[PDB]
Amino acid sequence: SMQEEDTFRELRIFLRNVTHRLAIDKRFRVFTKPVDPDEVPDYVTVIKQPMDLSSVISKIDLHKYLTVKDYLRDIDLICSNALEYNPDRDPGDRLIRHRACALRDTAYAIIKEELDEDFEQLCEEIQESR
């Protein structure tokens, strides 16, 4: 129905806004674009599902997210990829992991405060009906 398509449009608006706010945060610069093959050639061999905030924006616009839970799976993937690829004790790896955790925690915190649970449940129920 048109009411359902309006629901998903509002969802995309909400997701674009959250993603923007993450993408403009200086801490999260490393997560705004794909890892560059030239600089890190073993990346695509170790990490089987690369993800980044630019790809998330593209996915929003392609209607790939019909719930906030589906969006959060890709925010979680950005974070888990960073933890997996950079697991060592040195300061460069520890910094990226701290930033990855902050990206995840920040996204969840924005969503906890600004997503209406009945809106999410509506999206879930429409998604399940398809």
UniProtKB/Swiss-Prot annotation:
Residues 3-114 form the Bromo domain. Residues 108-130 form a coiled coil. Induction: Up-regulated in breast, uterus, colon, ovary, and stomach tumors. Induced in breast cancer cells overexpressing NCOA3 or treated with estrogen. Down-regulated in 5-fluorouracil-resistant derivatives of the colon cancer cell line HCT 116. It is found in: Nucleus. It comes from the Eukaryota. Highly expressed in estrogen receptor positive breast tumors and in osteosarcoma tumors. Interacts with ESR1 and NCOA3 and these interactions are enhanced by estradiol. Interacts with acetylated lysine residues on histone H1.4, H2A, H2B and H3 (in vitro). May be a transcriptional coactivator of the nuclear receptor ESR1 required to induce the expression of a subset of estradiol target genes, such as CCND1, MYC and E2F1. May play a role in the recruitment or occupancy of CREBBP at some ESR1 target gene promoters. May be required for histone hyperacetylation. Involved in the estrogen-induced cell proliferation and cell cycle progression of breast cancer cells. Belongs to the AAA ATPase family. This is ATPase family AAA domain-containing protein 2. The chain holds residues 981 to 1108 of 1390 of the full protein.
